[PDB]
Amino acid sequence: KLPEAYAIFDPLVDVLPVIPVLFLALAFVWQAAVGFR
Amino acid sequence: TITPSLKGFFIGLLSGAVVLGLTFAVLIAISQIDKVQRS
Amino acid sequence: METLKITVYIVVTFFVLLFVFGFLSGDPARNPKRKDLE
Amino acid sequence: VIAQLTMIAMIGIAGPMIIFLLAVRRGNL
Amino acid sequence: TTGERPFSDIITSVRYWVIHSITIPALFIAGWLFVSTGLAYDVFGTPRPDSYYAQEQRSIPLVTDRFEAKQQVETFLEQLK
Amino acid sequence: VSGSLLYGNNIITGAVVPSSNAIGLHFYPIWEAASLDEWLYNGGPYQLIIFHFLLG
Amino acid sequence: ERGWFDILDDWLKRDRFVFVGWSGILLFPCAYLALGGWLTGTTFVTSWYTHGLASSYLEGCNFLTVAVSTPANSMGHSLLLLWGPEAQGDFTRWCQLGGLWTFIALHGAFGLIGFMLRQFEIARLVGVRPYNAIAFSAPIAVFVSVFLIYPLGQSSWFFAPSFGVAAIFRFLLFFQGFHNWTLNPFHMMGVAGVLGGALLCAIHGATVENTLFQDGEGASTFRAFNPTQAEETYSMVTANRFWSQIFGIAFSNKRWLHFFMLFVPVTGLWMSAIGVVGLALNLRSYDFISQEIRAAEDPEFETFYTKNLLLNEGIRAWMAPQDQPHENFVFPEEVLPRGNAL
Amino acid sequence: SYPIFTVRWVAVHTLAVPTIFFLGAIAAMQFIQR
Amino acid sequence: METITYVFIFACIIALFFFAIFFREPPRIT
Amino acid sequence: ATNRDQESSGFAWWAGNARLINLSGKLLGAHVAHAGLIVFWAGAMTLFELAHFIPEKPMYEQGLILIPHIATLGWGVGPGGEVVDTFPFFVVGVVHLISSAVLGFGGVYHAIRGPETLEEYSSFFGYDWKDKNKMTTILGFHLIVLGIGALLLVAKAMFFGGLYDTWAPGGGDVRVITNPTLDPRVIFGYLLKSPFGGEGWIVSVNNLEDVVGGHIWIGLICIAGGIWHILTTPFGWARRAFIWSGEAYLSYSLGALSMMGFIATCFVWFNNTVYPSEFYGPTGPEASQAQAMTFLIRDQKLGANVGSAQGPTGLGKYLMRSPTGEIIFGGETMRFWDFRGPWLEPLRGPNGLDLNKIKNDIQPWQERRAAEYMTHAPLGSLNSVGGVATEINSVNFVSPRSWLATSHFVLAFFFLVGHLWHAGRARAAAAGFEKGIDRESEPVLSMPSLD
Amino acid sequence: MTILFQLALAALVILSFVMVIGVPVAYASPQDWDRSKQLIFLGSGLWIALVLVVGVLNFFVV
Amino acid sequence: AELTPEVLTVPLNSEGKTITLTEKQYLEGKRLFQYACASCHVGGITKTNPSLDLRTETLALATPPRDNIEGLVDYMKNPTTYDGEQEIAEVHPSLRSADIFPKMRNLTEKDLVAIAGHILVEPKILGDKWGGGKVYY
Amino acid sequence: MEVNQLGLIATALFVLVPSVFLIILYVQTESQQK
Amino acid sequence: SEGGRIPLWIVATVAGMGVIVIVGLFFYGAYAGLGSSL
Ligand code: CLA
Ligand code: CLA
Ligand code: CLA
Ligand code: CLA
Ligand code: CLA
Ligand code: CLA
Ligand SMILES: CC1=C(/C=C/C(C)=C/C=C/C(C)=C/C=C/C=C(C)/C=C/C=C(C)/C=C/C2=C(C)CCCC2(C)C)C(C)(C)CCC1
Ligand SMILES: CC1=C(/C=C/C(C)=C/C=C/C(C)=C\C=C\C=C(C)\C=C\C=C(C)\C=C\C2=C(C)CCCC2(C)C)C(C)(C)CCC1
Ligand SMILES: CC1=C(/C=C/C(C)=C/C=CC(/C)=C/C=C/C=C(C)/C=C/C=C(C)/C=C/C2=C(C)CCCC2(C)C)C(C)(C)CCC1
Ligand SMILES: CC1=C(/C=C/C(C)=C/C=C\C(C)=C\C=C\C=C(C)\C=C\C=C(C)\C=C\C2=C(C)CCCC2(C)C)C(C)(C)CCC1
Ligand SMILES: [Ca+2]
Ligand SMILES: [Cl-]
Ligand SMILES: [Cl-]
Ligand SMILES: [Mg+2]
């Protein structure tokens, strides 16, 4: 576990590692916005 | 005698005739309403 | 068997040297179009 | 469990939000 | 093109989404309730987690007679007390 | 295990048999064997063939 | 002539997003019902009463393990019609008896008929030769041999493949252990045709893509093609020299190349269908008699063939009691074939 | 300018309507406990 | 005799490879 | 918008980053933002692992891969690899996560706000791919950087607490390395070892002295090479041997990374020194040997004479000879006789496993260790059901060794594919036919027929 | 110090979210770049400050 | 079939006394068994010594008897060989050897009771599968 | 090995008969006027 | 009514996220309740 003082951030910490994948997905949203020109 | 399975056969026959019948009725109807333009 | 070993080692070294020096011998220039790739 | 889905909801929306905001404002996409 | 309205036209229109922000969630919810109410089990005859075996039974309720199979299944279901 | 035609195999059953589990990942060229008879017993042809094949 | 038949013909053959045709009347309901039946069964329907298996999302199965399973062995080869003497019109009981299996298999079959007829009809209307339908004869030969002929030669529909991912895998392993199906030269021709087809697909795609003429300025080369252009988009001559110098032989005739691309996988599948037809009667390539006579007399004689038979024997003994529950197999620990330790 | 109810519309909905219903069902299924 | 048959067929196939490669009908541009 | 569509760039959206080949500023943005992604993952993954971490369970029962890396450096662990302080893990994770914000900031800036090209802005940061000297200069900078990294490892090992040593006398423990191996005969001797069984090339490194000395060597080599490349331009033979373009250098790096990927795969699969089994779980060989050890112990306790016990095949049930005569565990684990591990070695004599030591000297900690490793063998399903493929659901386990080996084989392979793709494209583009054959100048048409 | 810590850290997270959306949008927006550059400078200095604050207060809460 | 109070009713001691476990106790028992025991005792067998299993009859014939909550809990504190003759805490997980088997460190008396209860209830459900090994999979 | 004693003739005719058919057709093709 | 009012990239992003959510739920369900093995 994280030190007790940080325990409230457990759910955020549970989610963080997946964020990089979102950047790949972001690239497509962006490309969708410019019509994949 | 009409056994339960012969009755079943008749039910199947009717069901198939109904499905195909309604299908052709509907398709003919639609074909008549939405004719292709020629000439 | 030692002689077979030495023979194979020499053969392998030979062909390997042919491969390496061969690709070192201006391979980019060996094409039908643009040769000046140096 | 509710907290985790809330976090991934804000984080998850952030990107498309960036794109949406830029598209609305005719940004340099 | 074959005369039908382009899909991109349809699905980028307000009216489509007015219709479908209703119809799609409604269908999803209907399926959900189809399961959560247990109706699916009853319709299809699928065992609930508590209905595979009688309490002390470890034998599969396998159908072993073609023409009395219906009755066999009913008996197996009855034996679940 | 017999793999060859002359030792009782046909085309479907025949094989070059993998090298001995006793060898493992050890490199077993012909010259590591005390004899060809040993090399053959322990499945040296398998290693020679697959290594030359993969390189080739 | 302008009666109702021709007017119907007019509407049926209208150029719309999804072509219908006369073939559509057979195809679409049968295909829709086959697929819908599969989804319905895999979502909601058990195989508890037929197999002693869970097979639906409802029961906790996932996409890999869900199936619409075959009927109980006791059903024999019953058409298992909803209105038949087994279910007697009761839909729930019908589901519980495995009615969805025959439902799916038969609607599936007529649906495949509809699809191939569709291929013929469209080929005729557009004015092309009907090689797509002819090639489609192979998938049909496979479906018919495996899902219909095979169980028809066996005791019941029970031993047909169940419509499911894992179930199909089970079907594969059953065929190994019981039929030694890998040893069967018709299956071997099937394999050669499938892998050979994939090889031809890959090699042809890559060859075309790597002998393209530069027809644009773009480094991405797809736009530099126009459907209506007269010229070949790639160099047959250069491709031919390349493979001639690489492999020793090469295509020189594009028509031959593509006919060959039809021929290889279709023929492969057809051969496999013939083999499965053999397996319907248990007419297997299980053994080499010379091998067995030698091994019987010589306990030092071992080939990969004999090893594989040991594997088959294990498969049979360990899987049969649960895979074939109608047989009431009880195999005592002591009769189970096992090597040392395992 | 464009018709709404076409053969294509029908085909699409025969697949899409049950699909959403089923996905809702299976989603509900994920919370079932023995 | 089996072995002879198998090896024979194989050898025929290899020879066939040889002829099919070096003695093929040459491809000609018309 | 410059070069951000196909008509102007020549590259479709799906090849969009190729639009960046000659836009050094935006390409710098791409690179820095990406480094941001990597550091971000290191940090967030570390925090996730720590949040999920139960200190009294072995790490390898908990799906941990980064904490094992930190622990191997000697942080947060004591004797036997027991966790004594989770705070170092927290620090590593947090500092990476924070640093990632910085890299991301610079990356986003360069990518969308900063100068698209750097050449007009700066002669030092600007570059031409075809400028061989600038390329070798930048390469030199990065080589010095890497050398500094390796020396950072040496520093950790020698001056800042040491490294976890599974081989430490009296049991695995964090240990300061005071006498690193400098002898070039040993160090490069590793580089000349066979990659086959019983040798295993660099993967065979089995003591921290060799590791640290090796990193001393690599650090100095890398710094010297960096200086070399800042001070020199490529010789004639190199000029004539290579393709000099962005895509070519990319292809070379892809090849190298592929090679490195496969090396890492074998490293995590076989090596238990820089990948301590305390943290990563037992290797396959380790666990098979551990099974043999376990039952040798069990049956010997029951009164079996394990030296004279003949198995069904004629081979020793428990003990047999390797092909060179060494006494080894028998059965299938015969294949793994090259395995070496701290729990087994005390039973090893000059001729291999010593029967008298086996009879008299096996300690309870060895039985425990062998049982633990045997029952934490790196076998398991994709949904992480531990054990053989036929095992029932019960145990939630896949060895970290398996996750890291499989992931890195997949990555190394696709990077080999990328290498072929980009090397071939760089060749074709350099020669000027990457877009296809000139219809009016088809080379083969000017070649004589083959027959 | 737990009040200071837990809110300085919540503020760090919040500001981070704000920067994550705001900075790229600012970088790519045509107008109001003058106001944006200064807001980004401020946000960045404040972010660094909050990181250091959380960092110090850490040892008085753990 | 259901996980009824009767199924969850298992022997507390050798003197005819029973204890009825709650469903939550059964779940805790499965969880803790998986956590601490299943690496070797998956499915009721013993990977490092298959001669000895966790079948109820076998536990009944162990010395002292282990076919009750108390026997199993004591085992988890002070494991012996099957005849009770030697104490094996040094090579087997126990509270007494929590120093060398660190997963036992956070196990409470309640936890031991839950694990014991899992061990006794599971064969009542699974029959020959419990301790049966691969033959019964 | 106790092989089927007809396997030899079966294989031999299996190879020879169609091979001969093909050789006949090829050779009579070549001898036609160019 | 008017085609184009709601941009296609938004429709795609929202629909895609919906798919990710539902599939994600199915994977959660692989570890909980029926089929979880527990
Ligand atoms: C053209 C599309 C088509 C086709 C080819 C089929 C084909 C099949 N379906 Mg059907 N099915 C369809 C559409 C189709 N289906 C549709 C749209 C539905 C949804 C309502 C269903 C629902 C359905 C169900 C629920 C079931 C089937 C089943 C069957 C099979 C048995 C049918 C039978 O026995 O008919 C017999 C009838 C005929 C062949 C029609 C004969 C018409 C003749 C020429 C006219 C004579 C009739 C006469 C007027 C009647 C006088 C009788 C008098 C003396 C009393 C069969 C494989 C069953 C099955 O699969 O079980 C496993 C089954 O249970 N289908
Ligand atoms: C590692 C991932 C990665 C990276 C670093 C890049 C980098 C870059 N891409 Mg891209 N690209 C990628 C993946 C990536 N790409 C993928 C997967 C694809 C295929 C879908 C593409 C397809 C692609 C194309 C088709 C093109 C690029 C181009 C570009 C560059 C200009 C982008 C632009 O103009 O923004 C415009 C977009 C915006 C202004 C919207 C906001 C974007 C910002 C950067 C998001 C930042 C969010 C982040 C959370 C904020 C944190 C800030 C905080 C630290 C304070 C840029 C250098 C272009 C280029 O070559 O230019 C010449 C170009 O045309 N890329
Ligand atoms: C180096 C790569 C790597 C490795 C070895 C691991 C290893 C591990 N991770 Mg980690 N993880 C990684 C990257 C990696 N992860 C990344 C990048 C992320 C961010 C998304 C995460 C996020 C993550 C989380 C959130 C968690 C883990 C956890 C775990 C463990 C369980 C893994 C699992 O169950 O897989 C499941 C298997 C899959 C999901 C299948 C992956 C298959 C991919 C899609 C195929 C890739 C193919 C190729 C690259 C694509 C090329 C295409 C081609 C056409 C070019 C395991 C120890 C878990 C854990 O137990 O923590 C304690 C945990 O909770 N990981
Ligand atoms: C490889 C990484 C890299 C590179 C090559 C560049 C290159 C460039 N940057 Mg960029 N930058 C980077 C990362 C990088 N930056 C990052 C991460 C950020 C976010 C903090 C920024 C933020 C940034 C801004 C805001 C600006 C630039 C600009 C500049 C240019 C002038 C820089 C200068 O004059 O330095 C002269 C040297 C110094 C000022 C002293 C450097 C002190 C360093 C930090 C000491 C520590 C070095 C240490 C070894 C780093 C290890 C980090 C490692 C752990 C990752 C130049 C083109 C400018 C520009 O493009 O103008 C239009 C500009 O305004 N950069
Ligand atoms: C990433 C780091 C890096 C990179 C990209 C380069 C790249 C470059 N270096 Mg090198 N260099 C480096 C690090 C690096 N160097 C270091 C650290 C040193 C100090 C030791 C040197 C010292 C150096 C010198 C002294 C020279 C170069 C030269 C060159 C250039 C051509 C080299 C080449 O053709 O290699 C191809 C390699 C060969 C032709 C060697 C023989 C190939 C054998 C057969 C391969 C055997 C390896 C095999 C895969 C197995 C590995 C194990 C093995 C040891 C048993 C080139 C620009 C040359 C140059 O032009 O300088 C300006 C040059 O003369 N470099
Ligand atoms: C450092 C590594 C590296 C780098 C810098 C590049 C850089 C470049 N490559 Mg790439 N490439 C690489 C590795 C790398 N490559 C590898 C390993 C492969 C083998 C698969 C390829 C194969 C490749 C091809 C086939 C092509 C390129 C191209 C290009 C250029 C444009 C890339 C583009 O815009 O992609 C845009 C990005 C996308 C469209 C996204 C790709 C999606 C991937 C395959 C799935 C990711 C799976 C993920 C890890 C796990 C699942 C997550 C889930 C959310 C989906 C660009 C110059 C193109 C080119 O030739 O340029 C000249 C080109 O056509 N590359
Ligand atoms: C049989 C029956 C019949 C009919 C019925 C039917 C026909 C129904 C329909 C229905 C159907 C029709 C179903 C629905 C569906 C689908 C679903 C169930 C869902 C899904 C999928 C998915 C989930 C997606 C995902 C994935 C993939 C696949 C793709 C991409 C990727 C991803 C990941 C996304 C009748 C009644 C007459 C009679 C009796 C019986
Ligand atoms: C660390 C820290 C931070 C973090 C930050 C980050 C960095 C995030 C970012 C963000 C991200 C980075 C996200 C991204 C996004 C979006 C999404 C969700 C994605 C997607 C996709 C889609 C859904 C797709 C669809 C479509 C396309 C568009 C086109 C084509 C078709 C398709 C279908 C594919 C914070 C603040 C939290 C605080 C705490 C901690
Ligand atoms: C170029 C671009 C690209 C990419 C993008 C990027 C790659 C960028 C980046 C990078 C990044 C990477 C950024 C970020 C994030 C991070 C942050 C924002 C930081 C913060 C941190 C904090 C806040 C921490 C807190 C903590 C404490 C300290 C303790 C424990 C708990 C917690 C966790 C709370 C794309 C594809 C879109 C396309 C277009 C263009
Ligand atoms: C830390 C470590 C240590 C040490 C390390 C070492 C010292 C190593 C090294 C260094 C080195 C020394 C590395 C390497 C190698 C190099 C490379 C990898 C090469 C390559 C080659 C190539 C690639 C070329 C290409 C081609 C040729 C072949 C021909 C012609 C054309 C061309 C040129 C293109 C040890 C292990 C003891 C232990 C552990 C840790
Ligand atoms: Ca319950
Ligand atoms: Cl063994
Ligand atoms: Cl027993
Ligand atoms: Mg569930």
Cα torsion G219, G225, G231, G235: sign: positive
What are the tokens at L91? 């090579």
Q: Is G187 annotated as belonging to a binding site? A: yes
* G77, G157 contact by CB (below 8 A): yes
Closest by Cα among G166, G178, G213, G161 to G284: G178
DSSP character at residue G178 = I
Query: Please, what's the largest Cα pairwise distance for chain B?
Result: 60
Q: How far is CA I13 from CA I3, I9, J263, J330, M19, in A?
A: 15, 6, 41, 45, 12
- Element (DSSP H or E) covering residue F45: helix F44-55
The span from the CA of D18 to the CA of J48, in Å, is: 26
- Contact in structure between J86 and J7 (CB atoms under 8 Å): no
Give the number of other Cβ atoms within 10 Å of residue C11's Cβ: 10
Which structural technique was applied? X-ray
From the number of C-beta atoms within 10 Å of its C-beta (0-12, 13-18, 19+), residue J426 rates as: buried
> Cis link prior to L64 (omega < 30° from 0)?
yes
Q: Which residues contact G267 (CB under 8 A, 6 or more apart)?
A: G138, G189, G193
The candidate with the shortest Cα–Cα distance to G67, out of G48, G82, G84, is: G48
Set out the domains of chain L in order of their start, with CATH numbers.
Answer: 2-130 (1.10.760.10)
Contact J339, F24 (CB under 8 A): no
Residue E46 neighbours by CB distance under 10 Å: 23
J320 strand-pairing partners: J328
Contact criterion met (CB < 8 Å) for K28 and D27: yes
Question: How does J349-358 read in b/e, with b if 16+ C-beta sit within 10 Å?
Answer: eeebbbbeeb
Residue J321 DSSP SS3: strand
- The three-point CA angle J388-J393-J399 to 5° equals 50
* Sign of the alpha-carbon torsion through N28, N30, N35, N36: negative
Give the count of beta carbons closer than 10 Å to the beta carbon of residue G284. Answer: 16
- Residue reference for tokens 């376990």: J294
Three state DSSP letters for G56-76: CHHHCCCCCCCEECCCCHHHC
CB count within 10 Å of CB F54 equals 7
J367–L contact, CB cutoff 8 A: yes
One-letter amino acid identity for B39?
A: S
Distance between alpha carbon H33 and the CA centroid of its chain, in Å?
A: 26
Residue L20, helix vs strand vs coil:
strand
Distances (CA, A) of H14 to E33, H11, H21: 20, 5, 12
Which pair of tokens denotes residue J418? Answer: 């990328």
If you take atom 42 of ligand 2, which residue's CA is the nearest one? K24
Helix H, strand E, coil C: the string for N1-37 is: CCECCCCHHHHHHHHHHHHHHHHHHHHHHHCCCCCCC
d(CA L91, CA L100) in angstroms, rounded, equals 9
**Contact yes or no for J68/J50 (Cβ under 8 A):** no
Rounded Cα distance between K50 and K48, Å, is 6
Residue nearest to atom 21 of ligand 10 (CA): C20
Contacts of G318 (CB under 8 A, 6+ apart): G336
Q: Are residues J120 and J234 in the same domain?
A: yes
CA of G62 to the centre of ligand 8 (A): 28
CA dist B12 to E67, G92, G102, G122, Å? 18, 18, 15, 32
The crossing angle, in degrees rounded to 10, of helices G21-44 and B4-33 is 130
Residue J392 per-residue DSSP state: P
Q: What does residue C4 show for φ and ψ, rounded to 5 degrees?
A: -60, -50
Task: Indicate the residue type of A19.
Answer: I
**Which residues, at least 6 apart from K43, have a Cβ–Cβ distance to it below 8 Å?**
K15, K18, K19, K22, K23
- Are I2 and M12 in contact (CB < 8 Å)? no
Residue with tokens 């640290």: J212
Asked if residue J161 has its Cβ within 6 Å of ligand 4, the reply is no
And the tokens for I7?
A: 């090896």
> What are the tokens at G320?
């049969």
Closest CA to J37 of J108, J89, J87: J108
Asked if J434 lies within 8 A of G219 by C-beta distance, the reply is yes
CA–CA separation, J318 vs G342, rounded Å? 16
> Six-digit token pair at J445?
């048409």
Give the rounded distance of the alpha carbon of K54 from its chain centre.
Answer: 12
G253, two tokens: 């005739």
Residue finishing a domain among J377, J399, J425 = J377
Q: How far is CA J378 from CA J398, J405, L37, in A?
A: 7, 11, 18
- Spatial separation of the C-alpha atoms in residues J390 and J381, rounded to whole Å: 10
Q: Is G179 annotated for ligand binding?
A: no
Residue M27 burial (CB count, 10 A)? 9
Task: Please state, in angstroms and as integers, the Cα–Cα distance from residue E48 to each residue in E58, J322, L5, L54, following that order.
Answer: 16, 57, 19, 30
In sequence order, the 6+-apart residues with CB closer than 8 A to the CB of G27 are: G111, G114, G115, G117, G118
3-state secondary structure of G301: coil
Q: List Cα–Cα distances, D19 to A31, G31, J122, J251, in angstroms.
A: 10, 42, 31, 33
| Measured distance between the N- and C-terminal CA atoms of chain E, rounded to whole angstroms | 63
Same domain, yes or no: J3 and J27: yes
Q: Which of C16, C18, C19, C20 to mutate to test the pocket of ligand 5 (most atoms within 8 A of CB)?
A: C20
Say yes or no: J220 and J311 in one domain.
Answer: no
| CA dist., res. J375 & res. L47, Å (int) | 7
Atom of ligand 1 nearest to the CA of G94: 64
Write the CA distances from G40 to E27, G93, G97, H12, H26, integer angstroms. Answer: 16, 15, 15, 18, 11
The single residue listed with the structure tokens 């837990």 is K6
Work out the number of other CB atoms within 10 angstroms of the CB of residue H14.
13
Helix residue ranges, H only, J3-127: 6-9, 24-52, 66-72, 87-108
Give the integer Cα–Cα distance in Å for J251 and J416.
9
Which of the other chains make 3 or more beta carbon contacts under 8 angstroms with chain M? G, I
Q: Are G120 and G23 in contact (CB under 8 A)?
A: yes
Question: Residue J420 CA: which ligand is closest?
Answer: 6
Task: Please report, for residues A7, J183, L18, L73, the alpha-carbon distance to residue L14 in angstroms, rounded to integers and kept in the order given.
Answer: 45, 69, 9, 13
Residue J320 maps to which CATH number?
1.10.10.670
> CA J68, CA J281: separation in Å to the nearest integer?
10
SS3 content of chain E, % helix, strand, coil (to 5): 55, 0, 45
Q: Which strands form J348-349's sheet, in the order they lie side by side? A: J319-321, J327-329, J352-353, J348-349
Q: Whole-angstrom Cα distance, residue G172 to residue G178? A: 10
Which DSSP category does G219 fall into? S
Residue A18 Cα distances to A3, E53, G27, G327, angstroms = 22, 42, 45, 51
Q: How far is I16 from I23, CA to CA, in rounded Å?
A: 10
Number of domains in chain J: 2
In angstroms, the CA J337 to CA J362 distance is: 19
F15 to chain G: which residues are within 8 Å by CB? 303-304
Task: Please identify which residue in the block is written with the tokens 């306990």.
Answer: G299
Structure tokens at G240: 């031919």
Contacts of residue G278, Cβ cutoff 8 Å, sequence gap at least 6:
G184, G186, G284
**Phi, then psi, of C35 in degrees rounded to 5:** -95, -25
* DSSP character at residue G164: E
Distance, CA of L75 to chain centre: 9
Dihedral over Cα of E62, E64, E68, E72: its sign:
negative
What is the Cα–Cα distance from J214 to J186, expressed in whole angstroms? 9
Q: Is the dihedral of CA G299, G303, G307, G309 positive or negative?
A: negative
Resolution limit in angstroms? 4.5
Strand partners, G213: J437
- 3 state DSSP class of J413: helix
Q: Which of J350, J377, J404 is the last residue of a domain?
A: J377
> Ligand 4 centroid to J36 CA: how many Å?
14
Take residue L29 and report the two structure tokens written for it.
């028992």
D1/A11 Cα distance (integer angstroms): 8
Q: From CA J6, how far away is CA J113, in angstroms rounded? A: 22
The SS3 of residue F32 is helix
Q: Is F13 helix (H, G, I), strand (E, B) or coil?
A: coil
Task: Calculate the alpha carbon distances from K10 to A9, D10, J61, J245 in Å.
Answer: 9, 15, 33, 48
E50 touches chain H (CB under 8 A): yes
Task: Give the separation between CA G254 and CA G236, rounded to whole angstroms.
Answer: 8
Q: Which domains are seen in chain E, by residue range?
A: 1-80 (1.20.5.860)
3-state helix, strand, coil in chain I (%, to 5): 70, 0, 30
Name the residue with the closest Cα to ligand 8, atom 20: A25
Contact, G137 vs G263, CB < 8 A? no
DSSP H helical ranges for D1-29? 2-24
Under DSSP, the state recorded for G107 is H
Q: Residue J280, exposed/middle/buried by CB under 10 A (0-12, 13-18, 19+)? A: buried
Question: Which residues neighbour G75 within 8 Å (Cβ) at sequence distance 6 or greater?
Answer: E63, E66, E69, G86, G97, G98, G156, G157, G158
Q: In 10 A of CB J241, how many CB atoms?
A: 16
Q: Residue J238 C-alpha to ligand 5 middle, in angstroms?
A: 10
Which of chain J's residues have a Cβ under 8 Å away from the Cβ of C27?
241
Of K26, L108, G74, give the one whose Cα is nearest residue E71.
G74
* CB distance J203 to J271 below 8 Å: yes
**How many CA atoms lie within 13 Å of J132's alpha carbon, on the beta-carbon side?**
13
* H or E element that contains G38: helix G21-44
Strand partners for G212: G234
The span from the CA of A34 to the CA of A16, in Å, is 28
Q: What are phi and psi of J174, to 5 degrees?
A: -65, 135
**Residues J14, J127 within the same domain:** yes
Q: CA-to-CA distance for J296 and J366, rounded, in angstroms? A: 12
Q: CA nearest J111: which of J194, J12, J43, J31?
A: J31
Q: Are G72 and G47 in contact (CB under 8 A)?
A: no
- Distance of residue E30 Cα from the nearest chain L Cα, in angstroms: 29
Beta pairing partners, J316: J310
* Burial zone of H25 (CB within 10 Å; 0-12 exposed, 13-18 middle, 19+ buried): buried
Q: Can you say how many angstroms the Cα of residue E45 is from the centroid of all Cα atoms in its chain? A: 10
Residue of the CA atom closest to atom 5 of ligand 10: J214
CB contact under 8 A, A12 and K2: no
d(CA E55, CA L6): 10
**Torsion sign across C-alpha atoms G312, G313, G315, G319:** positive
The J residues from 392 to 451 touching I (CB cutoff 8 Å) are: 449-451
> Which atom of ligand 2 sits closest to the CA of residue A37?
25
**Single-letter residue type at J57:** K
Q: Which uninterrupted H or E stretch holds E38? A: none
CB contact under 8 A, G39 and H18: yes
> Which residues make up the environment of ion ligand 12, defined by Cβ < 5 Å?
J 331-332
**Angle at Cα G15 formed by Cα G9 and Cα G18, nearest 5°?**
100
| Residue J395: Cβ within 10 Å count | 24
Picking from N37, H30, E48, the residue whose alpha carbon sits closest to that of residue L31 is N37
Phi/psi for E75 (5° steps) reads: -65, -45
- CA–CA distance, G82 with L121 (Å, rounded to integer): 43
Contact G170, G316 (CB under 8 A): no
Pseudo-torsion of CA B1, B3, B5, B7, nearest 10°? Answer: 70
> Quick check: L2 and E52 CB within 8 A?
no
d(CA G286, CA G183) in angstroms, rounded, equals 7
Superfamily in which the K1-62 domain is placed by CATH = Photosystem II PsbZ, reaction centre (1.10.287.740)
Q: Whole domain around residue J178: which residue ranges?
A: 1-281+378-451
The DSSP secondary structure of J172-219, one letter per residue, reads: -EEE---S----HHHHHHHHTS-SSTTT-GGGG--SHHHHHHHHHHHH
d(CA N38, CA N34): 8
Retrieve residue E45's tokens: 């005859």
A7: number of Cβ within 10 Å = 11
If asked whether residues J165 and J272 sit together in one domain, one would say: yes
* Distance between first and last Cα of chain I: 50
Mutating to test ligand 3, I would choose from A1, A10, A18, A26 the residue with most ligand atoms within 8 A of its C-beta, which is A18
Amino acid making up residue H4: I
**What is the identity of the amino acid at A36?**
F
Domain ranges of chain G: 3-341
- Token pair 């009409």: residue: B2
Q: Is the CB of J13 inside a 6 Å radius of any atom of ligand 6?
A: no
* Distance from residue J314's CA to the centre of ligand 12 (Å): 14
How many Cβ contacts (< 8 angstroms) between chains C and J? Answer: 37
According to DSSP, the residues that pair with G68 across neighbouring strands are G163
Domain boundaries defined on chain K: 1-62
Q: What is the dihedral of CA F42, F48, F50, F51, to 10 degrees?
A: 130
How far is the C-alpha of J265 from the C-alpha of J277, rounded, in Å? Answer: 16
Q: What is the residue whose two structure tokens read 């080692």?
A: C9
Ligand (nearest to CA of J244) = 5
Same domain as J272, residue J156: yes
Cα J14 to averaged position of ligand 6 atoms, centre (Å): 9
Structure tokens belonging to residue G47: 């195989």
Longest dimension (CA), chain J: 88
Cα J434 to ligand 2 centre (Å): 26
Structure tokens, E33? 């309730």
